[PDB]
């Protein structure tokens, strides 16, 4: 894990809108200014662009990772943007526009599809590890699992349908977390009904359901799915061991120190370090094993986004430029690409050369 | 040590001036010892130049200069690269036998590859020598045309900007050879022609390069459409077939090769052309006049379209997801077009089916779990029926390993598809696969079948492991029978099969002895 | 359809008598259609015979007869095989260019392969024609000697009993060519010479064959010992090196080729010879007179001994378990013998190290968990140190993929060894591997390193999966970091790396989501 | 599973010493006569020879699978033979001669090593799936795990030592069962102390221990290790589900119908069919799911050996002869072999042929 970084945005954003800082150092590696990113509205496109759904606005701002105030062009949407995500392969951008989901392809910028299966505003969007499926949660208390293949290959006459519909939650969904893999992945959802549910993507079955005494505003898991971290509405983070449907968490497994609701949760690659952003205007960095706050960083407003991620070469190289420019994202309903390390090895070239030499003789 | 070995070679070079046949072996030993990476190096360079000066010892000096270029220190290389390049250019115009020209072109390719990475040397070599080197390559004898192409390729690989002044002339050298009956000459000509848009300055962040690339692709598509329309409308039919194959291979190489600037790939046009080519199966041709010749030529046209589809898939990756419906309708259509016996022998049209199954495997590789293969519909059902027919054994002159190769290709495609999309795949498919594969793996260890080849048995065991690893959530895989099959196969005489069964048993032990409680 | 296509070819054969260059393409199409696999067949046979009769159209008739032999019905083949064989034999004595001889020999090999499986035709062809065919093959011109060898190989592959009468003469044809500077001619001569003990009647359930095989092996061992003693005692040194390589390759081919009768393999003698060859590293040679030439030649002798060890391992399998101590002392000794910089460039003696690592991988493959590699002792520690040095990146003219190939070989050996012997391997080894590999996989996705080649990255991910799959029982593997690495690699541009990371993620999902409770 | 067969021997052996009969048919596929095989003394060498340790004798008899009364040559031993086994790869033969273990290599017949670590007579010998390890149990109440590599590569000065020594059992070992794999395999041992223990080969740890109210005379598991079948000293077979350290079996999981001690247990490949030989002179064939006796076969004496195994081509082909003769097994302390299906495929030969044709042009 070479230089894990924390990417944080708050609501006030007086002089900086986004801050990228090293986990174990705390020095501001990168800063961005220009707007106010909304909750769940921060995404990294292709490891080279920073997309932020503006808080309360109808558009999405973009930055280059190596340039401050790099707001140039906007992704117009018909209505307000509630959530924003990008596929891990960097090919598609999902935005929750009111009750609908707009899908753009980064290759051309075309608005590929507008999925309107939710009857209430979409609260969160997530992709799987291999970008085969994406999961949408809204204030309609529904968790929809969409196959990307089905969504992209749909005749506009027959509207695309979700692969799975999950209505076990009774209150609006607040967060989703997807594990590694595609069909074999597992999805963690958290709701205002004080419940966190673990589902299997392929079978669509409910694997686990943990009940808490407070509303759960954030949820995450480590890559190995050893534990599950749930951030509640009173500033308390609960750890549930997935090695032990319908449990009921009751109170050594809880992190203390946040005052207002914890809305962002992220785990380092090794799973020993936890990042938590709260509405108390603070991002806290915790030791998972000892449940002790390693670090506390004060912001100028309620934290809307906070994540731990491996810093790409973009954040490390001060001379980095994106390989492709951002296209123009169409507001209403080839391929731009670079065509394309199989270079011949050393006995490859030597064997070719001595084949030529022998062929002379 | 190196100094001792270098002084040895310098001293015992008096065998040359008879150990000339032994020279390549000594030279391989010298580069294996790493003695090159400097009085000894200077003496070796001088001896190489002296040998190249004569007309009878040119091979020895050329070999010595090949080693020098291969493992020169960065200091010696910079000071002597211009002299080596001039010597190679002088040799390239000597009316020497084509083997000497081939050796000189190989050495020149190495020299150009190693010179393009030195900013000071790169520009000097480029402006002061590359046009002359290209003119010398264009001036080679027809018998050495093959050699010339490699040289041109080298000049267009590491010095593209300075090749622009002769670019048009280079084009005249390539169209003449893309319609060549020699497979190696035709392939090399296609590779050279695919590099034409990258030549020149390419102003405005490669905007000119992008425009030239797109114009060349569209012109190739138009020419391919004209040729295909002419084919489907004796010697002339063969000429059009050869030209069609060359042009389509050029287009596929342009799709699947590195290019400096971003380009806009027209996917719809290429897919429409591929579908148009594949839409003539057996009955539109009829049988009258030159009709049987078109029927004979048709599988080659279909194979060339399949190669084009492979190149497009490689170029685009997962971006073809919204055309996956067309792709999954195309594959069983081609399988139905070329489907036709006695046990053993060999089914016809096997190469086309192998190409289709390779397309399927590559598509699953680039699309992951989104490939949508064998997941409902008539096209997926037809593809599965063809796969299961091609992997089933056929249950006097003939081959023991009859239809082994189509069986192996279908097994690879099926195992990749299962491993990546098994949970999404319906349970009846999984049950059919179990009922077909478990008796097969139990009976290969216990006549003339495709599974008399170890590669087919390895692919069958891979499919078994894929069924164990990616099963339907509602259809548990047969674990004990698969474990028995792997235990039987790990004792097989074939090394690859037994090794795969050992690794598969390790994976199955991981599958059978959990490390954390389930949920 | 077949009848329509065959009649088409018969009618449009008038292009020959100009579509002669197009004939191979038409012929590939004809065998792809399966129209052959009978009036049309008879007409094609007659036309082929007529073309072969002339001296200018021999290539066309030879191609036609090649197709006929390839896909004849078992009825036509039986009735016309003797005529085809006589025509091939007649062509083999025509003073034709060597390309015609090569084509005729290929067709003859196919004919002999397809004739040996018919008991009625086999004996007739054997007794009535094989001595004459062998005499014709022995009588070819020197320029066609290459071709002759393949023909002889064919005669010794499918008709071994009838080759006995000329066996001694065949031997005189093979010793002359095992010391040949052309790698293809030398390899073919070694392959032909390795088949000498299988010739003849072989009475008493192959007792004579077994005795001849053992006598030939012992004579080869004695000759190799004499040659090695002479080498370690200018042009003559090269001659002895070439003869040593040829004889050792013959012995290795005899070890690793099919033989009719059971044989007694002397393992101790061959192992003693291999150790004797490998026991001269760098200092016994010194530097005086022809000493530097011996130092130059030494890596080739060591490589030839390593090839012999590979052949012995393939022949014997797990039976070398009681010599595994000697094998595991030999491998780090050869690694220490050839170990020697600036970042990039290339380490010397890379081919020898790659051969050693391939030996290690093959040994683990044939011995399973009993290989006993990296399991304590000085030899295992030295081997591990060499492996870890050869997979570590080196942390201006040069190659971007510097030392990639030794790195890939060591990665393959290490991953196979871990996958098969990880639980037995000590935990400090596993921890060292984690501390070396996890930063590597995290940093390949995020200069001049061996891991700039996709094959090295694929092997590194394979080693990571092997560490996940076969860990120490007392040292749990890092699962979350490996999952992150696989997720990063599945988004890589390289197709092989991304595909492997997808399959490895499926396996890791199996490892992470248990199906049954543990114990 | 093409024609699973049952191989059974009893003590009396009036006219037949060994019987191979089809599981679902019951017809005698093959018979052998000549002696009286002892308990645990039946082995198949290389799928082509039948080795039987003679009951109460100092030698081992051999048969060819396709020939009756094919007793020709004997494996002399210094003392009485108590148990006999062959490695699954068919390269080695282990015999328990009194308190020692004699190892022969089938390639040469040489007595490679005599391991004398047991201080009492060896009762049973087993190999792992890949022949990397072998486990020995004796009346000394010890279970020894030997690495084949360590045993074969030992200087006669320094005697070989067991890789693992397991002394948790308190009474003599009656049976051993080894799962698939090598280092990752698991071993089930049963003792007269009414206990069945499951160990891990690599770590050497005790994974499970189940206690019964009667002495356990036989033990086996299915290939997937779903269940464990333990045959006691009163004719009762217990099934323990391995999906649930120290248990204690207490009495729907037990097979009824045998009168005397059940000494042989074997499970079919699919795990749906169980074979059980008892001292009541009967081999019974049970349905695993329904716990019902499918079939009952009466013998002329107490059953000493009974197994279910996949019939090789040797048992199916009436014209089968072994590829190599049995060597002479030395009584006191390179390689004979056939040197080494990679034949060129159809486009292999076609591509070679058209390469030649193009090379002409």
Author numbering:
A (entry chain B), D (entry chain A): 3 to 246, 251 to 257, 262 to 343, 395 to 401, 407 to 427
B (entry chain D), C (entry chain C): 30 to 46, 61 to 80, 85 to 280, 305 to 411, 416 to 470, 511 to 561, 566 to 638
Original authors' sentences:
PELP1 (Proline-, Glutamic acid-, Leucine-rich protein 1) is a large scaffolding protein that functions in many cellular pathways including steroid receptor (SR) coactivation, heterochromatin maintenance, and ribosome biogenesis. Here we show that PELP1 serves as the central scaffold for the human Rix1 complex whose members include WDR18, TEX10, and SENP3. Mammalian PELP1 is composed of two domains, including a well-conserved N-terminal domain referred to as the Rix1 domain (based on homology with the yeast homologue Rix1), and a poorly conserved proline- and glutamic acid-rich C-terminal domain. The Rix1 complex is a large and essential molecular assembly containing the conserved PELP1-WDR18-TEX10 protein components (RIX1-IPI3-IPI1 in S. cerevisiae), with the inclusion of the SUMO protease SENP3 in mammals.
Single-particle reconstruction resulted in a 2.7 Å resolution map composed of a C2 symmetric PELP1-WDR18 heterotetramer assembly. The refined structure reveals a highly interconnected tetrameric assembly centered around two dimerized PELP1 Rix1 domains, which form an α-solenoid structure resembling a horseshoe. Dimerization of the two Rix1 domains creates a hollow core within the center of the tetramer. The two β-propeller domains of WDR18 sit atop and sideward to the dimerized horseshoes. The C-terminus of WDR18 threads through the center of the hollow core towards the bottom of the assembly. Our cryo-EM structure allowed visualization of all eleven LxxLL motifs and one of three PxxP motifs embedded in PELP1. Seven of PELP1’s LxxLL motifs are localized on the internal (nonsolvent) face of the PELP1-WDR18 assembly, while the remaining four motifs are solvent exposed. The structure of the PELP1-WDR18 subcomplex revealed that the majority of PELP1’s LxxLL motifs play direct roles in mediating subcomplex formation through hydrophobic inter-subunit interactions between LxxLL motifs and ordered helices. Instead, this supports a mechanism in which WDR18’s C-terminal tail plays a required structural role in anchoring WDR18 to PELP1 and then fostering PELP1 dimerization through “capping” by the β-propeller domain. Interestingly, each of the four solvent-exposed LxxLL motifs in PELP1 had their leucine residues buried away from the solvent surface, most of which reach back into the PELP1 structure to facilitate α-helical arrangements. Therefore, we reason that these PELP1 LxxLL motifs are not compatible with steroid receptor binding via the AF-2 mechanism, raising questions about PELP1’s ability to coregulate steroid receptors in the context of the PELP1-WDR18 assembly.
